[PDB]
Write an enzyme that holds these catalytic residues in place. Sequence first.
Site, PDB file in Angstrom:
ATOM      1  N   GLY A  44       0.796  -1.229   0.000  1.00 37.24           N
ATOM      2  CA  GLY A  44       0.000   0.000   0.000  1.00 37.24           C
ATOM      3  C   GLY A  44       0.825   1.274   0.000  1.00 37.24           C
ATOM      4  N   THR A  45       0.143   2.411  -0.127  1.00 40.47           N
ATOM      5  CA  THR A  45       0.808   3.719  -0.133  1.00 40.47           C
ATOM      6  C   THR A  45       1.325   4.054   1.262  1.00 40.47           C
ATOM      7  OG1 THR A  45      -1.200   5.042   0.314  1.00 40.47           O
ATOM      8  CG2 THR A  45      -0.683   4.574  -1.999  1.00 40.47           C
ATOM      9  N   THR A  46       2.220   5.034   1.336  1.00 39.55           N
ATOM     10  CA  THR A  46       2.845   5.406   2.600  1.00 39.55           C
ATOM     11  C   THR A  46       1.911   6.285   3.429  1.00 39.55           C
ATOM     12  OG1 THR A  46       4.998   5.392   1.465  1.00 39.55           O
ATOM     13  CG2 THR A  46       4.933   6.305   3.703  1.00 39.55           C
ATOM     14  N   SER A  59      -2.643   1.958   5.689  1.00 42.80           N
ATOM     15  CA  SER A  59      -2.061   1.534   4.420  1.00 42.80           C
ATOM     16  C   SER A  59      -2.431   0.081   4.151  1.00 42.80           C
ATOM     17  CB  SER A  59      -0.539   1.680   4.453  1.00 42.80           C
ATOM     18  OG  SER A  59      -0.158   3.036   4.609  1.00 42.80           O
ATOM     19  N   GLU A  92       0.176   9.481   1.665  1.00 46.42           N
ATOM     20  CA  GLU A  92       0.462   9.595   0.240  1.00 46.42           C
ATOM     21  C   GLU A  92      -0.728   9.059  -0.558  1.00 46.42           C
ATOM     22  OE1 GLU A  92       3.942   7.847  -2.744  1.00 46.42           O
ATOM     23  OE2 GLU A  92       3.254   6.580  -1.102  1.00 46.42           O
TER      24      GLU A  92
END
Lengths: 235, 111, 195, 240, 231, 244, 243, 250, 241
Positions: free
Chosen positions: G29-31, G74, G46
Site C-alpha cells: 500500500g501507499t505510505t 495503508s 500519500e
Amino acid sequence: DRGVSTFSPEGRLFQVEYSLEAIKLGSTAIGIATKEGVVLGVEKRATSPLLESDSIEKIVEIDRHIGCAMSGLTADARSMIEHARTAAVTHNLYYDEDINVESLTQSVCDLALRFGELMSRPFGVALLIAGHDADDGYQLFHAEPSGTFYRYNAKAIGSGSEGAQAELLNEWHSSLTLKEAELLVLKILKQVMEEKLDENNAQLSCITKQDGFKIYDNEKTAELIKELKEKEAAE
Amino acid sequence: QFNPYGDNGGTILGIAGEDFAVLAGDTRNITDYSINSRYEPKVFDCGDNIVMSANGFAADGDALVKRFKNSVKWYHFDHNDKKLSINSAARNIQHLLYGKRFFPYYVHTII
Amino acid sequence: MDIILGIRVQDSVILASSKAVTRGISVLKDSDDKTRQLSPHTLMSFAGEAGDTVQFAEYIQANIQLYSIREDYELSPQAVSSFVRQELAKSIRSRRPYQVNVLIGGYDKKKNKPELYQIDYLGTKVELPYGAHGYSGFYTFSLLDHHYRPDMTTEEGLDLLKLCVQELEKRMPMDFKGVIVKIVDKDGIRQVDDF
Amino acid sequence: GYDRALSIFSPDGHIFQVEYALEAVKRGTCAVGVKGKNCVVLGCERRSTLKLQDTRITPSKVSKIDSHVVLSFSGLNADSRILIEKARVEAQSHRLTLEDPVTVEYLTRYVAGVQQRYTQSGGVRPFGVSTLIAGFDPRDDEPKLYQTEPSGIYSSWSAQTIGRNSKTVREFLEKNYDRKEPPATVEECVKLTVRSLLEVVQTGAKNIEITVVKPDSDIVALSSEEINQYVTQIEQEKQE
Amino acid sequence: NNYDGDTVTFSPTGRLFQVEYALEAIKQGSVTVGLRSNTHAVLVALKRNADELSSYQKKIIKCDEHMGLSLAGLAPDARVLSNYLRQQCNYSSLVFNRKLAVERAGHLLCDKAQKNTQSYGGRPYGVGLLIIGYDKSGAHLLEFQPSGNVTELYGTAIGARSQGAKTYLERTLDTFIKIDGNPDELIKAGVEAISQSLRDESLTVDNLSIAIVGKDTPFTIYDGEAVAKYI
Amino acid sequence: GSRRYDSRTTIFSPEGRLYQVEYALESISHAGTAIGIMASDGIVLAAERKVTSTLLEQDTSTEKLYKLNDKIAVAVAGLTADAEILINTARIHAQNYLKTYNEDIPVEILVRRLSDIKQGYTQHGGLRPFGVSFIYAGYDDRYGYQLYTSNPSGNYTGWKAISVGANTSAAQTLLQMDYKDDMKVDDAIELALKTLSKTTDSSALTYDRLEFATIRKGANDGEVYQKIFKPQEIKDILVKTGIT
Amino acid sequence: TGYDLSNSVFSPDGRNFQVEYAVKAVENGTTSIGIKCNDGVVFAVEKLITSKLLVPQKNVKIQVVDRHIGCVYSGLIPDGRHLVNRGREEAASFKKLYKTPIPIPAFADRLGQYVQAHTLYNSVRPFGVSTIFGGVDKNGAHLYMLEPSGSYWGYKGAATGKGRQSAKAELEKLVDHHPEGLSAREAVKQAAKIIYLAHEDNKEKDFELEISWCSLSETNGLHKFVKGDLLQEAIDFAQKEIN
Amino acid sequence: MTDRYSFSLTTFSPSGKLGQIDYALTAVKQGVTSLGIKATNGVVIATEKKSSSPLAMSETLSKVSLLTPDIGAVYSGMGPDYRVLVDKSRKVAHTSYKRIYGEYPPTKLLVSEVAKIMQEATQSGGVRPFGVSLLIAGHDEFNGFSLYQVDPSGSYFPWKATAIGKGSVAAKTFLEKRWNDELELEDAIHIALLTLKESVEGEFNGDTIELAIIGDENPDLLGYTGIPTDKGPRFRKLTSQEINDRLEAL
Amino acid sequence: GYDRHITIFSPEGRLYQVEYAFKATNQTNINSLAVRGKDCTVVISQKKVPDKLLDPTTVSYIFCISRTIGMVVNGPIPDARNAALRAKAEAAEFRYKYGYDMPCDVLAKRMANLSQIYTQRAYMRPLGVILTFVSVDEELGPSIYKTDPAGYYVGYKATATGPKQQEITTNLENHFKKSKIDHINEESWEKVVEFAITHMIDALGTEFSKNDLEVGVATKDKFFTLSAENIEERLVAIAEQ
Ligand SMILES: [Cl-]
Ligand SMILES: [Mg+2]
C-alpha cells in the site's frame, strides 16, 4: 473440496456454468413471438413406450396472460413455477391488475443466485416465459440459472438449440402470423428431434390477448403437423 | 395510562366529475379547543395524477400518506416506470391499512 | 352446542345428540350432526364453543385415521379415549383452550364389550354405563338411575333414551330441535333415521 | 446446523449424488406395476438369501398411503419409510382441509416434490429410492399408476418396473403389454405381473408378492398359495 | 493457485485471488462511460445483445431522482447493489428529509462489498458500477470496484476496451469539464468517448444507452429513437 | 474454512452405497455374537461377552442384554456407549406411548421408531452413524412373540431366529439347519448355546463369557415375564445342556 | 506443509502465516505516517494520482472517529474503512455508557481486540491494513499503530506502507534532534516533508498530499483536516527540502 | 465466526476403526498409572503424583477427586480433560439427580452420566474425544461398594480390581494373583501400595502418592451434628502421614 | 495430514497445534520470573524496546487483572491482551455473583478450563501464551499459579517462563534446596524484588538497567507495577552490596 459460490479464473461461477451443461442435455423447447401472439413448443422425449406421454408436463400456465416452457432438470422447475404463480397472484391481490411479463420474469430470476453454504445449488433448468401485457404487448423471455434474462423475438433452448436458433435466425420476421409461427415451431422441432415428430411426443401452446394461455390438444396439433407436411411437399 | 391516539379535527371532501375530480379539505389543525395551525395542508399530490388525504389523527394521516407516496416510488422502480392507476392505488392502500388491522391508522382516507 | 347423551347397554353404545345450531337470536340450522367417526367401531359426539367443537373433532379424527393407516390396526376405545383426554388436558393450559366436551362410544372387538367414555374440556375422563354433558344429566340421570340395567338390549336402550329426551323436551327452556341417534356395536356405526 | 452442499453439479452437468442414489435403486429388489382395465397390480421381489425370516412381522414391500392408494419401492428400505410416513401424513392433511382424499397424481406429485427438495437442500443426501404409486381417484374407476425417482421427476405409466434386473422385465412388458387392450380382468393382470417377475425372480415360492388394488378402496394382498397357483399355471403353458 | 479456493485466503504475496477473479468479470463486460461538467453528469453505455433475435441487455439503473448508475459485469449483482442504493437513498429521504450525498452513497457501497471479501461462505460481487448524481455540492461521478474501492472522478470507463475511452477523456479533460448549461454537447463528448472503445461494431439506435442528471434535470435514461439524435 | 475437514458422512458411493453405514457394519462384525431364537412359548436371547478378565465383576456387569420395558428386551452388537444412547431413547418412547394411549407399546412401533432415528443419521446432520446392531425380543397382544433386528442403516426386519455381530454367516447356517417352527423355549435355549459354542472364537464357552435372557409366558397365567439370567444360572444351564 | 492455507493455524514454528501474508498487502500500500507532537498528533498520507481524471482533494483517505480521534491506514482501503466503522461503534457505546469520550488507550485496545479476533478462526480473513491512529484525551496526546496480527503499541512516530523504511529513518532523526518535543505546526511541516521523501519508493506516478491533526492549542483537541494556506505552506516547505 | 464445524471429526475408517477413539486410548496408555481395588468393606483408588517440576506444589494438583460424598474418581491420560470432566460430573450429579430425588446418585448411574458425556465427544460436531480413562469408586445403600472404569469411547465396565495407563498390563497381572473376595479394606490398601510401587521409578512416599478410599461413614467430616440419618461422607482422601505409616508395614 | 492443522489426535495421541502454540509462547524472546515472600508475591519480566519510535511506557506484558490479582504473559501481545481482557471480565463477574474477590488459583483454573476448550473444540485455536497469575490470597497467602496452552495449571513456590526458563528454574531450585523453605524469608517486598532481580542476573548472566526490566508486586489487598525510578532504586541497592 471447493466453495459452491466460487469464481473461476475467467470470472464465471463454476456451478452456474455447470448447470448450463445440464440444460444442454435437456429436451428441446422453442418460443416464437408475433404481433398476433406468442407460441411455445416442446419435445416431450419419453424414455419408454409404456410411459403415458400426456403426463409429461413441460409447458405450464403461470397466469391467464403468462405461460412457460422448460428444458433441463425439469424437477427443479416445480418450485420456480410455484414462486411464479404465487408472485403473479400476489401482485393481483396487492394491485388489482395483471403483472407485467418482465416483472414476473425478474421475480423468478431473483431466486437463481440464492445458493450457497438458501438452497445448496443453482437450478438445473432453463425457462422460456411467454406472455402479454398492455404496456409492452406480446413478449418472450429466456430465464437462466445465472439470474440473467433476455427478451427474444424467438428462442430455442435444450439439446437442439444452436441448430434451431440458426433456423429461427433465417425464418423470423416482424410480420409473422400466429399460424405461421405454429408451423415454424413444429418445423424446427421436427428438424432437431431424434424420434419422428407427432402429436404424442411434441406439444404446442400459445398466449393471445383475447383467449390467454392455452395448451393445444393433441388433435389440434396433429392437424397442424399434417398442414406442415403438405406445405413442405408443395415445393 | 398512555393514549396513542388523538383527534386533529378537520374535514375533507371528494367529488368525481365526468372528466375531472376534486379533493378538498380545510386547512385548520386542532386539539381539543385550541388551534394548532390555520394553514396545515391536508390534501396531497402523490404523483401519477393521484391526490390523497387521510383525515383524523394527523400523525397516522401523515404516516399513511408518506408510505403511499413511497409505494408509488417503488411501483415505478419494480415495474418499469408504469403509471399507477387509481384502482391499483386504492387496492394498495387497503393493504397498507389492513396491515395495521390490530393497531389501526386512526384516519378516514380519500383519494 | 347443547344436549349430548350416551348409554352403554349389553352389546352396544348409543349416542344421542341435538340437531339445533343457535347463533344468538336465530336458530340457523335444525339438522346438525354433532358427531365424528374416529374409526369403524369408535364414535365421538361433542358439544361446547362454536368453531372449536368441529375443529377439535376433525383434528382427533384425522389423527386416529393416521394411526389406523400407519399400523393397519384399529385402536381400542380405551386407547382412543386416553389419546383424546391427553389432548384436552394439554389444551386446558394452552394460550386459548379448546372449550369442547365429548362422549366417546366404542365397541372393543378384542374384549367384545361396548364402552362409553365421558370427557370434559378439562381432560376429566370417566368410563360410565351412561353419561351426558352440560345440563343434560340434571334432567335425565334420575330416569337412567332408576331404569338402567347392564343386560339391556339395544331396543330397551333406545326406549329409555326416548323417555330421557321427552323429559328434556318437557322441562328444558331451550328448543334443541330433537336428536340424531347413532348406535355403535360389533358391526360398526349406524344412524337411527326415525326418532 | 450442518449446511454442506452434498448435491452439486459436475463439469459435465451431472449431479452425482442424485445419480448414485439411482445406483442404490438398481441394487434394490425388483418392483413392478401393471394397470388393467379396472385394476392395478403391484408385484414385488423378495430375495431368498434371507430364510428363518418371520414373514408375519417383517415390513411388507407394498404400503397403504390411504385406503385407496398404495406405494411400493426399490432401493434403501430405511429411506422408503420416511417417504411413506410423509405421504401418509399429507394424505390425512388433504382430507382434513379439502374434505376429499388425495388423487393418485397429487400424492405422487407430493412424494416427488419431497424427493426433489432433498436434491438441492443443504446438509442432506437424496433418497436412494424410486417408488411406484398406484390406486384410484375418489369416485373414479380409471386405474392410476405413477413412478418417482431420486431426482424428483415423475410420470404416468401403463406398466413399469424398477430395481434390479428391471431392464429385463421392462423388455418383457414392452412386448407383452398392449395399450389398445390392457388386461381386462384381475386374473389377466395378476398373471401378466407374475409372468414379468418370473423372468427375473428365481423360484416362484416366497419370492413373489402380489397386491391387487381395485376401485373404491378395495385393496387385498394375495397369499403364498394363491400366487403359487399362478406360478404353476404359467410354467405348464410354457411346457409347449 | 492453492490460495484461490475462497475469499477468506490471502496468497503468499498478500493477494486475494477470488476478488481478482471477480474483477476479471468486469473486463469481460460491455463498455460503459461516465463523465461530468459542473452542471451535469452523463452516463453512456454500449449495450450487448445475445444475438440478432435478442434484446440489448440494459446497463443503466435509476436509484433516485438525483442519482443512478451504469453496470459492467454480473447484472444480477448490479441489481442487488442498486437495490441497496435505492433503499439507502430512500432511508435518507424518509428519515432525514435529505437527498443522499453521492460521496456517502459510495462509502455505503464500499462497505457492503467489503463484508463479502473477509467472510467464509460468501463471494465477492462480480460487477463494476459507474454512479452519477447531482446533490448539494453539484455534479458527481463515482467508479465502484467489487474489491470495495470507490473513486470519485471527472470521467472514466469500465468494461472491455475501456482503455480507449479513458485515454480520450484524459485528453479532453479540460474541454468537457467546461461544458456547463449545455446537456447535448456533454452527451456528444460522452458518445465520442465511448466510440474510442468500439471495434467492428458501431453505435446503432438499439445499441446505445444514455443517462443524464443535472442542476434542473432529474435522472433520466434515453433509449431507442431518443438517442438517434446523437448517432 | 471448515469444509476442508468435513468427511461428509452422509454421501453415496458411485455404486450407491453409504460409506459410513458399510464401515459401521464392518465394525459390528468384530463385536461379540448375539443370538435371538423365537419359539411358540417364548423367546431366547443369548450373547457372548468379549474377551473378559477374571477380575471383571460379572454379576453387576451388563454389556449385551438390556431391558426396554417389562415386555421388550434387546441384545446389543457394536459400540456399547452408542447403544446406551439409543436404549434410553427407546425406553422414553415406550413410556411416552404408555402415557398417551394407556397401553404398552407394540413391539414393531418401538423398533420402527429407533430404526428411523438411525436412518436420520445417514441422510442428514453430517454426523457419524451409530455403530450398533440390535436384536429386539418382545411380546404384545397383536402379534405375540416377535424378533427383530436393526442395523446402522436404519433398516429393520423380522426373524424366527437371527444372529448379529461376529461369525453371523456361520451362526445363521447352524440356526437354519436345526430350527423348527414347533420348537419350544427349552429347546431354543439349547440351540442358542450350541450355536455360540461352535461359532465362538474362544477356546471354550463358559458362564463368565455369556449373557442370557428369556421372555416367557411362563409367568403365572396370562402374563409375560423377563428373566435376565444370573452368573450361577448361566452356569447351571450350561451343565444342563451338556456344554460344560 | 499446508499450514499457510488456513487462518488461525499454528505452523511448526508457532507462526500464523495468513497474518504474515496480510502484512504483504500492507507493505504493498501507499505510505502513511503519524507524528506525536507536544499537545497532540499529526497524520499524513500519500495518495497516488493514477490518472488526470481523479478529482483533486476529493478522495479523502484519513478518517475521523468520534470528534477527537484520527485514523489513517495503508493496504486494502476497504478493510481500513471496516475497521474504522467498528471503531466508531466502539466509541459511541463507550460514550453512551460512560459519558466521557473514549480515551485513546481504551480505543486502541478496542481496535486491537477486534483485529486479534480475526486471527482466531479460519472462517474469517485477517485485516489487510496497518492502522496509524490517535488523538487527545484527558491524559494528553497519544499515537498508536496497529498491525494485522492485532499487535499495537504507543509511538512517538509511526510509518507504514511501501515507503516505511525511508519514513522511519526520517522519524528517528526527529526523535533524536527534538527530545524536548515538536510543536503541532512544526509536525505538520515535518509530516509533509516525510511523505514527499517517502514518495521516492513510489516515484513512477505523481501524488497528492493529505494531512490532518488533533492539537490541544491549535484545534481544541478536535480532529481537523489541514486545508488551504496551511496545507500549501506545508507543501512549499516539503518541496524546498527535496530540492 | 460461528462454530462452522457442525460435522463429526470422529468417523469410521474402511476397517471399521474409529481412529480418534483409538488415538485417545493411545494417549491414555502414555499416561501415568492409576489403579483401583475393591474390598468387602470398602474400595481404594490410587495413582502417582508425577510432579512436572520440584518447584511445583503437587498438593495443589488433585488427581483423585471427590464427585459426591460417597463417590471418588481417578484417571490416566490428559489431566486437563480429566479436570473438566470432574466439573461436569459434579454438576450432573446435582442437575440430573439430586435436584430431582433429593439424594446423591448411585455409583453406576453417575458413571453412566459421565460415560454419556464422553460418548457425545465421540459423535458430536467439531470436537475430539476425551483423552482420559477414568476409574470411579463409590458406595450406595442398595448396590454397596463398586468400582468402574470409563474409556474415551464412553464404554464402562465394573471391576473387582484393575489398573489403567503406563504399566497397566503388568499391574493387572499383579492384582489377579493377590485379589480375593475376603479382603478387608486395609488388605486392599496394602495390595494397592505394593502394586503401585512396581510402576513408580523415583521417590515412593506419601508426598508422591495420591490415595483415597470409599469406606465407613465419617461423621467427623460432616461439619454438623443433630440429624441422626446424616452420618457423613464415605469418601476419604488419605493423608501423606497415613500413607507413610502403611509403607513401614510394607 | 490435517491432524496437524486442527486440535484432533495424531496417531501418537498428540495434539500438534497445542505443541506449536507452546512454541509461539517464546516468539517475544522475553523471560519472566515469579517468587513468594512472607507477605508478598513478586513477578519480574524482561523489557525490550527495539524501536526508537516506540513509546516505551506502552510496552508491557504485565497486567492488573483485579485489585488483588496481577498477571504476566509469555507470548505475543495480541493473544496476551485477549487473555488479559477475559481474565478481567471473569474476575469482575465472579465478585458480582459470589460477593467476594476471585482468588488467584480459581482464576487460573477458569482460564485453564477456557484453554482446555480450545484444545478440544476445532473452530477455536489455542492462545499462544503462558499466563502467570500472582496475588496474596486472603486464605492461601502468597500465590503463584501458571496456565499454558494445553489447559494445564498448577501452584508454584516460585516459577520461571521464557526461552531461558531452565537456567532460571535450576537457579531457583538450588536456592530453595539450601534454605529448605517454600518462600523468601523477608519482611519487605522491596527486598523480595531485589532477590528476584539478583537471581535473574545470576541465571541469565546479564546486567540490567532500569529500562531493561518490568516488575509487578502483589501485597495484601493490592497488586501494583513499579515505575522505572522504583526499579532504579532497586538496582542501586543490589549494586551497593
Ligand atoms: Cl469453568
Ligand atoms: Mg482448537
